[PDB]
């Protein structure tokens, strides 16, 4: 038989409430190069 | 139906880079860009009288590239240049490239066959310069979901 | 893993079948051997009934290379001297030790349980009863027989062999009672199996009116089963041979069981009437005929061919496996099938490939046109979602898919009518008409 | 085809108006479920054997 | 060294077996020669009227040819990429962190070491049965992807490469038969092997 | 989980054949089998050298992929 369900919307309410999410991804510090191309293994 | 559009980002011809000896090409004609084409099919069918069927793989892949340039352009002199500089010195070839914004992309060497009519009258003419690709394999590598 | 030379020199001078011996030499339901030698090393004595077995069936032409050996714990074996022999010899082996003896049947049975207590081993009427102290015995020389019990019946022990193991398709069975040979029949039957027998009973060649004889219980209750009458039947239980000269076999190409030679047994000597019952039986024989020998016509219990068994077994497996790899294929990237209109007929292109297109390549499925007046090609058909009941939509389930072939046929009899003039021939008609 | 239906304001209560909630938004789908299971009536024959003609 | 100093690495030949003039064969019996091995210090075995190196393998255990392979790519493509920058920054328009010039960093890498390697044999290339392709592979990122940090730096990072090599043979092995008597038919069961 | 957490449902894709790396084949017999069936507990049986889940049913008779 058909499924019933119900969907809800609330003023304040956040889909997710207020979870960090998935971790971003880093920005490397700055720092000095000899290289101007260097390949590594 | 919305349920069919085959492309989600408008197709910008802009998009499609075109790299010769390393240097990014410019100075297109009006209607199109580059085509590309191969000289020999794929593979060779030798039937027998009775229905017997044998094929064969080929060996020759080269193809030809034609690049349709404004006869005004910049990038005309420098395949005239290339033209004599390797008819002396003997070092014809050079590498190609080919960047399909949304569809086969390219990457192989290639030199110049033939050069172009060259006309002038009361518009800005054009150049269909031939250049003939080693291997003329399309890569479907720009496309995503390949599995 | 070191290797101290560069370049070193040695210079020395498929189906499988399943074999339901009686024994103890190891706790497995069922073991794989590739030869005799893997059988000795486990302690098999040399003749005993699965040794004889698995070097039948390897010397085939068609021979495989995996033997499968069942095991229904042995109780007891006996050795019976009712044939008269003057030499005899007898191959026994205690745990990890193989020997041999030597020697009117009783005094003969006598001597050779004397000569065993020289295990346990007491004499009885014209046979030895051996059993084993907390052994198995095999042929030497001599015309006496091997004749091993057991406490399980094999109509429950073969559940728990095919539990443990179900890649193999032949099934033979060393109790010669009727009732194992039927319930083994029966099972077969059930599993989609290939039952093998053979039989060294007399009732075979009986008139064709008396129906007392296994042939005949076998044909009423119209199963399927390879049955042959042999002599050596149960002294070195020929199934072997006839296996090994058709396990190779490929059933696409539509061969034919019938006129083949098998080594290991040895001509029937019975006369032309006998033959004429024999067949009336469906128990197939091994004639011998120009210096050679030959298998007839491979008829099963139920009449039907062998051929056309194996053939309808191997495609009714090639087509399940064809379309169970695909869906799975397909429903392992997403993109699971789906009961439509758009998404069905692909099925046609699965099917056509893998059996259909091999069985015409090899020749067994035929093709072309009739006179009937009607094409001999194969046909497939599959249904519109239109005429899906909704149960069958509920089940998720497709019912109703039609396939129809054709089959070829081998060569089994030829008549020749010559003739012979000694005279002048007369002038023919001279009617140099076209033929209305 | 999937069908959306909404009110309007002259059917809306007035206690949902002074509460500002609406209600009955309805949606309605159908699911285009999946294959698992088929069949097949193979046969196989040594040969093969009414000519109407007439459309039905 | 003299007898590796003029080896091009784009070959990936072996050190294995060759001979080198001075030294003489190693002395040590079987049990001597398996210890040594065991500890992955190469000696110089005498065969058949000569003497020759054996295997080659390094103090980690990995192949020398590998560790000069990789050298050998490692410095030329810095060099390529090094000279083409260069040259490209010499008349002005410098290169430039765009999606419509970094490609071309395709071509540069594809150029001068990949090429040759493929083409003396070092590299390999084909398809495998794993039902994947040997083809060498160039990734470049795209600009959407580059951090503020190394917009700020100016440099780009994560272009990854990956190739397959090939295989000197070391060892190989034998099994010959010898039949006294007439040997018997063979099956003759004339089928199409399934 | 590792086979369906990712899919997303707008494909209507079920979990009746999924290979699922972990699970070991069931063991028992067809008539274990049918037995399991009645009782919505599915199993991961073996078939031609590789694991396949079963059709993958709730509680209540219902598929999982319509919830």
Known sequence: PPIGIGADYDKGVKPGGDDPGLPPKPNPPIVYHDAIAQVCM | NQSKILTLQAYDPAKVLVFIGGQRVSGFAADTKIVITRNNDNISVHAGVDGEISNALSRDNTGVMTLSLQNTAKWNGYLAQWQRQANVTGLIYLPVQVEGSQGLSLNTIGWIQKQPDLSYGTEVGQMDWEIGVLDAWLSPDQIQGIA | ?436
């Open chain 3, 1 to 436: 893993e070191y290797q101290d030379k560069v370049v070193d020199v040695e210079v020395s001078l498929f189906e499988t079948p399943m074999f339901l011996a009686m024994h103890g030499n190891f706790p497995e339901r069922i073991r794989f051997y590739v030869s005799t030698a893997g059988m000795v090393a486990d302690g098999f004595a040399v003749g005993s009934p699965a040794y004889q077995f698995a070097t039948n069936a390897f010397a085939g032409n068609f021979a495989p290379q995996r033997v499968a050996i069942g095991r229904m714990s042995i109780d007891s074996s006996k050795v019976d001297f009712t044939g008269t022999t003057e030499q005899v010899v007898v191959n026994i082996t205690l745990n990890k030790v193989v020997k041999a003896v030597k020697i009117t049947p009783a005094q003969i049975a006598t001597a050779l349980a004397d000569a065993v207590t020289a295990a346990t081993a007491v004499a009885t009427g014209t046979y030895v009863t051996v059993t084993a102290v907390s052994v198995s015995v095999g042929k030497g020389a001599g015309v006496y027989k091997i004749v091993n019990e057991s406490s399980e019946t094999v109509a429950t022990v073969l559940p728990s062999v095919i539990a443990e193991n179900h890649n193999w398709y032949f099934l033979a069975t060393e109790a010669r009672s009727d009732a194992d040979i039927v319930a083994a029949a029966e099972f077969a039957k059930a599993n989609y199996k290939l039952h093998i027998y053979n039989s060294t009973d007399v009732d075979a060649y009986a008139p064709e009116n008396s129906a007392a004889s296994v042939f005949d219980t076998l044909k009423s209750l119209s199963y399927d089963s390879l049955g042959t009458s042999d002599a050596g039947a149960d002294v070195d239980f020929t199934e072997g041979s006839v296996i090994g000269a058709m396990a190779a076999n490929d059933p696409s190409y539509g061969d034919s069981l019938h006129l083949k030679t098998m080594p290991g047994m040895v001509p029937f000597a019975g006369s032309d009437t006998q033959r004429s019952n024999a067949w009336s039986r469906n128990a197939n024989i091994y004639r011998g005929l120009y210096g050679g020998g030959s298998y007839i016509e491979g008829k099963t219990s139920s009449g039907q061919y062998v051929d056309v068994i194996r053939f309808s077994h191997w495609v009714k497996f090639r087509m399940e496996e064809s379309v169970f790899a695909y869906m799975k294929r397909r429903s392992d990237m997403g993109l699971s099938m789906k009961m439509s209109d758009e998404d069905l007929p692909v099925l046609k292109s699965v099917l056509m490939n893998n059996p259909i297109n091999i069985g015409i390549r090899n020749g067994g499925i035929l093709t072309g046109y009739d006179t009937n007046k009607v094409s001999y090609d194969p046909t497939i058909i599959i249904p519109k979602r239109a005429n899906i009941p909704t149960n069958d939509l509920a089940a998720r389930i497709l019912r109703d898919v039609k396939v129809e072939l054709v089959y070829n046929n081998s060569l089994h009899y030829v008549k020749i009518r010559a003739s012979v003039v000694l005279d002048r021939p007369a002038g023919q008609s001279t009617n140099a008409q076209t033929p209305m």
